Amino acid sequence: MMEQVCDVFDIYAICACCKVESKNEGKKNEVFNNYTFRGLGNKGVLPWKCNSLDMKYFRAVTTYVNESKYEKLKYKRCKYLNKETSKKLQNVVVMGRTNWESIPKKFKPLSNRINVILSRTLKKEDFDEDVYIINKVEDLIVLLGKLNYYKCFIIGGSVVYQEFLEKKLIKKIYFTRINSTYECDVFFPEINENEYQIISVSDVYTSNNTTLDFIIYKKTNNDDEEEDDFVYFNFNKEKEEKNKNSIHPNDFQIYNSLKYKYHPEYQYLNIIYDIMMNGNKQSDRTGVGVLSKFGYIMKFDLSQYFPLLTTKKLFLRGIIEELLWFIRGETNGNTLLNKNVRIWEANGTREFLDNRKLFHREVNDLGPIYGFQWRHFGAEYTNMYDNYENKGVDQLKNIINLIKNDPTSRRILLCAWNVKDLDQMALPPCHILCQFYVFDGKLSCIMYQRSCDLGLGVPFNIASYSIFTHMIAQVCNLQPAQFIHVLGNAHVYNNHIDSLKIQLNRIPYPFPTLKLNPDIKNIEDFTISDFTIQNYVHHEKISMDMAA
Amino acid sequence: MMEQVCDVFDIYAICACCKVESKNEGKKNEVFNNYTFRGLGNKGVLPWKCNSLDMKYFRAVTTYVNESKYEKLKYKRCKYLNKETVKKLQNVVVMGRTNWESIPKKFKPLSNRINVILSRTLKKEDFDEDVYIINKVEDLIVLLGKLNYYKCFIIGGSVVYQEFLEKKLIKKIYFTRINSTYECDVFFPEINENEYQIISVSDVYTSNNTTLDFIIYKKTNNDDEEEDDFVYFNFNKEKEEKNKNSIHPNDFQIYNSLKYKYHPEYQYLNIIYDIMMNGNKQSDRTGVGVLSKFGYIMKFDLSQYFPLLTTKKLFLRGIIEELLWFIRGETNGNTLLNKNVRIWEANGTREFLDNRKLFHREVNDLGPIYGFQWRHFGAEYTNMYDNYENKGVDQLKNIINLIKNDPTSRRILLCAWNVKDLDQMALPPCHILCQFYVFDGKLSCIMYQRSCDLGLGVPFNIASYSIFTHMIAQVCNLQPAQFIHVLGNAHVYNNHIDSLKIQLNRIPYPFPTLKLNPDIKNIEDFTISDFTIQNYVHHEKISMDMAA
Ligand SMILES: NC(=O)C1=CN([C@@H]2O[C@H](COP(=O)(O)OP(=O)(O)OC[C@H]3O[C@@H](n4cnc5c(N)ncnc54)[C@H](OP(=O)(O)O)[C@@H]3O)[C@@H](O)[C@H]2O)C=CC1
Ligand SMILES: NC(=O)C1=CN([C@@H]2O[C@H](COP(=O)(O)OP(=O)(O)OC[C@H]3O[C@@H](n4cnc5c(N)ncnc54)[C@H](OP(=O)(O)O)[C@@H]3O)[C@@H](O)[C@H]2O)C=CC1
Ligand SMILES: COc1cc(Cc2cnc(N)nc2N)cc(OC)c1OC
Ligand SMILES: COc1cc(Cc2cnc(N)nc2N)cc(OC)c1OC
Ligand SMILES: O=c1ccn([C@H]2C[C@H](O)[C@@H](COP(=O)(O)O)O2)c(=O)[nH]1
Ligand SMILES: O=c1ccn([C@H]2C[C@H](O)[C@@H](COP(=O)(O)O)O2)c(=O)[nH]1
Incomplete structure (x- = not known):
């Protein structure tokens, strides 16, 4: 006006x-x-x-x-x-x-x-x-x-x-x-x-x-017949988005008022928008209640940034201790509890092991999970205290040696889905495999994830598998390129929607950077002190469950 | 004028x-x-x-x-x-x-x-x-x-x-x-x-x-200060695609002239383009030579069509025969060779097996491949002929039970990549896993492919896993919905470029349909004659190696 x-x-x-x-x-x-x-x-x-x-x-x-x-x-x-x-x-x-x-x-x-x-x-x-x-x-x-x-x-x-x-x-x-x-x-x-x-x-x-x-x-306030062809080709599209009334987009004034959303964090945010708006209403495993959709892919350029979400506060000490624990080959829940990492506490209780039919497993003995399959895949698992030296296949050595000796192999895969040992695990792995790709002295990594809790879980998952890429790349004298995150069953708990809606309307900040201690050249030789997040600028911590 | x-x-x-x-x-x-x-x-x-x-x-x-x-x-x-x-x-x-x-x-x-x-x-x-x-x-x-x-x-x-x-x-x-x-x-x-x-x-x-x-x-022939922000944002790109001059866009005259490329075949055609223009030049040692990229997702609506590429001719007898073979748990190349199906012929050779250091392996004994893993994952492989009764995990029967009885499970995976067994296989599996997803009595399937030959292998791979999806859907009394194809290492062989350029300039035909014999109620009881592709309309067959 x-x-x-x-x-x-x-x-x-x-x-x-x-x-x-x-x-x-x-x-x-x-x-x-x-x-x-x-x-x-x-x-x-x-x-x-x-x-x-x-x-x-x-x-x-x-x-x-x-x-x-x-x-x-x-x-x-x-x-x-x-x-x-002129x-x-x-x-x-x-x-x-x-x-x-x-x-x-x-x-x-x-x-x-x-x-x-x-x-x-x-x-x-x-x-x-x-x-x-x-x-x-x-x-x-x-x-x-x-x-x-x-x-x-x-x-x-x-x-x-x-x-x-x-x-x-x-x-x-x-x-x-x-x-x-x-x-x-x-x-x-x-x-x-x-x-x-x-x-x-x-x-x-x-x-x-x-x-x-x-x-x-x-x-503050206060060609054209080729454009028609677009309308004709969109003639069968459902009239409005399925859960429109259900989520009410008018609440996301800011998210929707943005023209260009080229910040990589929008890759996560837009999947959350997509699920809330067109996600299938499903209810079981507990009757807890989810919106779910199948098959997404996110790519982060680790050469330009560390993709630690900025639309809420995230903590990585626990995530890193867990990563170091997989690398050592460990299945012993106590090691992590002594460092007050309680990621795995719920899945080690007597009650949880008993529902999972593991009546003969020590509390916090998580069975043949990530760490055991990384360093001893095929080995008959006994208990978390056994040293399995030279038993089963050490995929972690194998894929590191393949990167160095045969960068152009298309068989550099790290797989935690041991079908023989699924039932013996406290929980079958959410993170099915990493595959690596080397071009021109540069390491990319694909992680396929069968099950993706988008408001609580995937934010951590991105960080884990981004840190792991760096660790691999450095250990093999390579520059990290992309982390590519493949989402399978991608779901939002109904309990998270009020919080994700708050979140969607926050403008991401420029991401931080990850500094690895450069002296570390064997995958087994990292310490929690070897890792530093630099220049992490973030919005307030959000309880995703807004319960009291 | x-x-x-x-x-x-x-x-x-x-x-x-x-x-x-x-x-x-x-x-x-x-x-x-x-x-x-x-x-x-x-x-x-x-x-x-x-x-x-x-x-x-x-x-x-x-x-x-x-x-x-x-x-x-x-x-x-x-x-x-x-x-x-x-x-x-x-x-x-x-x-x-x-x-x-x-x-x-x-x-x-x-x-x-x-x-x-x-x-x-x-x-x-x-x-x-x-x-x-x-x-x-x-x-x-x-x-x-x-x-x-x-x-x-x-x-x-x-x-x-x-x-x-x-x-x-x-x-x-x-x-x-x-x-x-x-x-x-x-x-x-x-x-x-x-x-x-x-x-x-x-x-x-x-x-x-x-x-x-x-x-x-x-x-034929004879706010816009907000369109300015778009140019500002794209201020940091290259003057060309890596191998643009290497291939020349002006060769894809028909392909680039189209305005709306909304046929699902374009998901395949467009990946061929992206690899040709932005692909990285690599060599699988001795100078065999490819353009590669990493991580792509295609999605096909099996409720709407069967996605058999129409931009060249494909026969599906072999492919269906291979799949029946998998389902029976067979590892025996001769069963296929006697059906005049040569898919596994090269890989079953004395020269080929000896090169995989499989010196104690009979000719056309492909070892513990898909068939063995789908029905016996974990059993120690003996030979082609051993009936491995009630040994290993039968993950095929397990996923068919999950689908009919626990349809909201996020644990319905079928894994071929058995790390224990890889070195004993004629070839590690290209097709790593299938995951399923049930919603409103409809079944969708993701399969993750580590190595993807875009010119020759993928067209058959889309068919294989599309048919498998229908088979499982029927046996579990569901409708087929989506087949979702996750490409890891996506490569076009340099030999294939001339032929693909021809294929890129051909306009797809409406896809055909697939009809299963509706009587078959167990995954085990399918035969070649229970399968019929209706209305396959396709361009001339293309040989991808135009070599002689
Ligand atoms: N699938 C589709 O997209 C379509 C299907 N169809 C099918 O096509 C068939 C009809 O085709 P067709 O037999 O070719 O008939 P038309 O619909 O082309 O009708 C032809 C008649 O229209 C009149 N007419 C046409 N041109 C002129 C003219 N220049 N000046 C004056 N009168 C003219 C005349 O009617 P009169 O005899 O009274 O002089 C002529 O006999 C039907 O079976 C119909 O189902 C029809 C349209 C499209
Ligand atoms: N990163 C960035 O975006 C930018 C960085 N900078 C930083 O800014 C610093 C200098 O900025 P700052 O000290 O604020 O000074 P300014 O560059 O804003 O200039 C101030 C001077 O401009 C003149 N002036 C200001 N307003 C008027 C007016 N209305 N009419 C007439 N003359 C006027 C006066 O100079 P006089 O007394 O001679 O009339 C005044 O003292 C530098 O150190 C530089 O590093 C500078 C620009 C942008
Ligand atoms: C809307 O009803 C009809 C329309 C047409 C013409 C027509 C129908 N479809 C298309 N794609 N183009 C056309 N020109 C033809 C018809 O039958 C002869 C119709 O009756 C069913
Ligand atoms: C072109 O060189 C300079 C430009 C500026 C101004 C400036 C620099 N960057 C941005 N984003 N906005 C600006 N207004 C400031 C400078 O230093 C004071 C410069 O010299 C180093
Ligand atoms: O790193 C992790 C670990 C777990 N989960 C979530 C996904 C599901 O909500 C649940 C896995 O349970 P099942 O899919 O096995 O039922 O845990 C994640 O999102 N990320
Ligand atoms: O069904 C199949 C079987 C094989 N290949 C191709 C992909 C690669 O070009 C090659 C396997 O090479 P490695 O991944 O084993 O290195 O076989 C396919 O594309 N599809």
């Missing part, structure tokens, strides 16, 4: 923001929000000196025009200033003198753009380079009114942002989240949850030893 | 065509083309009588209008026709008199459509109904230049379709391929490969005991 100057003159802002090096007062119990990324500068330069990929983005966003689109904009513009009217078409960039003087010399003036400097102290006079000056903010709307520009971009710094934001002159913010912590003296202003709303989250990337992503904030 | 009458007045053709009961004298092996589908009428009615879904398509297309797109169409019609001006908007349908009389009284005149009838024999006075009688094709274009209408549909019959193409007054043909054979007396005119081309192929469907799909012929 009507039109503010921001809409009319197509004036956007572009920035790139750090986390700040505060003296945290014995509180690794840290809360994170949109204001977490503000850091703009330090001693008159960027706090990270150079981020090569952001520098690529910033250029491509400021140096892009479509001539085609210009016609419409020249109308709506000229008709409003009430004055109705080089090339170009974008404007607006910068504070301080920012101008903090840009290196080689970049000045910014190629194929219309460089403008807001300054009161200096004037066209003082600048030995091809520019325009101005000494107030109203003076820019004027320079815009006259010139041949496709879009105008506010490229900082803080002072210039704060005032342009105050008088709501900016239509969108193209905002780079640099997901590391540096020293900062200057800061981006507290963006107003009311006035501006994220509408788009890019992919996550690694550049110069840090992950980063690109989001878009939007200002 | 000419503007076409068919573009200006938006004149379209819609039809439904079956195969003709033509005298196929010594043609049991017969050649198939787009004219295989040409049957329109028999004795003044449709050769198939009712097809519910053809009817639902026809109604949707011939009624559907869009008001926004009228303002432009009126402007264009007025311009061409000299004019300028400016209740509920409709399409015109144009039938011949025989067609009109062929249509049941309960459908006439056609709802929410302007009905035009061509006739000399009959004048306006011989009708009671709300229709326009015209007596020549020129009187239509007169009437179209007077009326408000969205689009004009020629709905037959044969004489009407004929003259409208004689005069190139048809912009596109919406053609329903009814994949069944019927007595016909009236035929659609042979479409001229030069004047018209297929730009779109829909999903395949089952209705009234036939498969059918929808194809579109086209006449």
Whole structure:
């Protein structure tokens, strides 16, 4: 409706923001929000000196025009200033003198753009380079009114942002989240949850030893016969989504208001959306009640990020201890309970072993599960205390030796589904197999999962099998490529829906990175201390069962 | 500069065509083309009588209008026709008199459509109904230049379709391929490969005991600041696909010209494309050589069709014989060789077994492969001839019991990959496992394939596990729903590229159906003659190695 100057003159802002090096007062119990990324500068330069990929983005966003689109904009513009009217078409960039003087010399003036400097102290006079000056903010709307520009971009710094934001002159913010912590003296202003709303989250990337992503904030309110062919080919599609009334999508205003959902966490989130909306109502094993669907695939680029969900808090100590426990060959539930890892406690009780008909199994003797099948597949299992040295097939050695000696084998599979020993296990494995693939000094891993609890379980599963990939890759002197997660029976407990709905409306943060201690070169030689998650920025912990 | 009458007045053709009961004298092996589908009428009615879904398509297309797109169409019609001006908007349908009389009284005149009838024999006075009688094709274009209408549909019959193409007054043909054979007396005119081309192929469907799909012929030749965010987001891609120049897109002229590739065969065809364009070049030692990628999922709706590739010829006797062999628990190659099925011949050789270090293994004794594992997993393998009675886990009987008695179990897997036995097998299994899923008395099957020969092996693999799905579904008194194919290591052999390029440019035919003998109530009691593929319409056989 009507039109503010921001809409009319197509004036956007572009920035790139750090986390700040505060003296945290014995509180690794840290809360994170949109204001977490503000850091703009330090001693008159960027706090990270150079981020090569952001520098690529910033250029491509400021140096892009479509001539085609210009016609419409020249109308709506000229008709409003009430004055109705070869080089090339170009974008404007607006910068504070301080920012101008903090840009290196080689970049000045910014190629194929219309460089403008807001300054009161200096004037066209003082600048030995091809520019325009101005000494107030109203003076820019004027320079815009006259010139041949496709879009105008506010490229900082803080002072210039704060005032342009105050008088709501900016239509969108193209905002780079640099997901590391540096020293900062200057800061981006507290963006107003009311006035501006994220509408788009890019992919996550690694550049110069840090992950980063690109989001878009939007200002608040208040062939054609080939398109018909689409409608005809969609003629048999059911009228509305099956559990529409049942889940009520109008609740996910934010999830649905996003245009571009290119953050990899959306791979998980969209499966949760898909199941809630089109999932089959099933009720048994307990009468507990699930929405279920069959056969999904998620791919994470471990070279660019560690995919630890950011739409809730996750803890990995337990997940890692469990991984190290499989690797040692162990089936002894006590080892994990002494480290207060209680993943397997429920499946070791006398009651649970008795329902599972294992009347002759010691409590917490989980039987021939992951660890035993990894290092001794085929061996007759006895009890958790037996050393099975040299008995059965050590698949874990075998697949590590296949990667090193025969990277191009298509038989690098690690299988926990021993059909002979299923009934002897406390619980047959949810995680059926990993298969590996080596290209050009790079390791990908497929994990097939028969049964996927999506609100409690798969989030941990992603992390486990991502960590395991790294461990394998390092041990075989390879770079990790993709973790590919194949979901079989994929289900949401009805108990989880209220919490997953809260979750779906949270905008993921840039993912963290995993640092393995590089000295560890045998799969058996990892210690809990060898693992570090770095720069994990996350929303509040969610109880998935909202019970009390 | 000419503007076409068919573009200006938006004149379209819609039809439904079956195969003709033509005298196929010594043609049991017969050649198939787009004219295989040409049957329109028999004795003044449709050769198939009712097809519910053809009817639902026809109604949707011939009624559907869009008001926004009228303002432009009126402007264009007025311009061409000299004019300028400016209740509920409709399409015109144009039938011949025989067609009109062929249509049941309960459908006439056609709802929410302007009905035009061509006739000399009959004048306006011989009708009671709300229709326009015209007596020549020129009187239509007169009437179209007077009326408000969205689009004009020629709905037959044969004489009407004929003259409208004689005069190139048809912009596109919406053609329903009814994949069944019927007595016909009236035929659609042979479409001229030069004047018209297929730009779109829909999903395949089952209705009234036939498969059918929808194809579109086209006449041949002679906030958008939110479309800007899309370009910003794709700022970091390559200038090419890895081996783009290596293969050349301009070779897939037909494949790339199609707009909507909604036929399920494209799931297979599109993976071939993705591997050819983005595949990694690898060597299986000694320089055998492949393009590989990792982790793809295809899904086929067995309730709607049987997915036997139609873009080359496939025989299924061998494949069914192999599967019966598996089910009996056999490991004996000779049983197949005596049935003239050579699938396992190469793998059963003295040279081949000796190369797998199986020096104590009789010729054509393939050892503990699928058959042995499905019925005896865990038993120590002796030889081909040992009846391994009540030994190992019979996981086939176990999964058939889970399905009929615990249908919501997430533990209904059938595993071939017995790690103990791998080195004793002629070949580790390519097909790792099947998982099943029951909902609302319908059965779906995932199978995970570690190594996938896209040109030669996969087409047969899709058939094998699609038939197995039907077999299990029947024996457990369920409907077949989905066969879901999870590709691990997906590779095209360099030998296969020339042939696949040919296959990629062939347009699929509607898939055939599969009928099982309904009497068989145990998985053990199936025989070759209990299996019949109805209506396999396919392109010429292709040899993938064009070698000599
Ligand atoms: N990562 C990022 O996105 C960005 C990083 N930066 C960081 O920003 C820092 C500098 O920013 P900051 O110190 O806030 O300064 P600014 O770049 O915002 O410039 C401030 C100066 O601009 C002039 N000015 C501001 N408002 C007006 C006005 N309304 N009319 C006229 N002149 C005006 C004045 O200069 P004068 O007194 O001469 O008139 C003022 O002192 C650098 O260290 C750099 O690292 C900079 C841009 C973006
Ligand atoms: N499967 C499908 O998509 C379709 C099926 N059909 C089937 O096709 C059959 C009918 O086909 P067909 O026999 O070719 O009949 P048509 O529907 O083509 O009717 C032909 C008759 O229409 C009139 N007519 C046609 N063109 C003209 C013209 N230019 N000027 C004046 N009158 C004209 C004449 O009727 P008159 O004798 O009164 O002068 C002519 O004999 C039926 O069996 C029907 O079931 C029909 C439509 C489509
Ligand atoms: C092109 O070089 C620079 C650009 C910027 C501004 C800037 C940089 N990145 C992003 N995303 N937005 C911005 N507004 C700031 C700079 O340092 C102060 C630069 O020099 C290193
Ligand atoms: C809606 O009823 C009928 C429609 C048609 C024409 C027709 C039907 N289907 C398609 N795909 N194209 C057509 N032109 C033909 C008919 O029978 C001769 C009908 O009566 C059942
Ligand atoms: O890592 C794990 C372990 C367990 N589960 C869940 C999936 C199912 O909800 C349940 C397995 O029970 P069955 O599928 O065997 O019935 O545990 C997971 O999602 N991830
Ligand atoms: O039903 C079958 C049998 C074999 N293969 C192919 C896949 C590989 O090209 C090859 C097996 O090679 P390895 O995976 O054993 O390395 O056989 C199939 O695609 N389908």
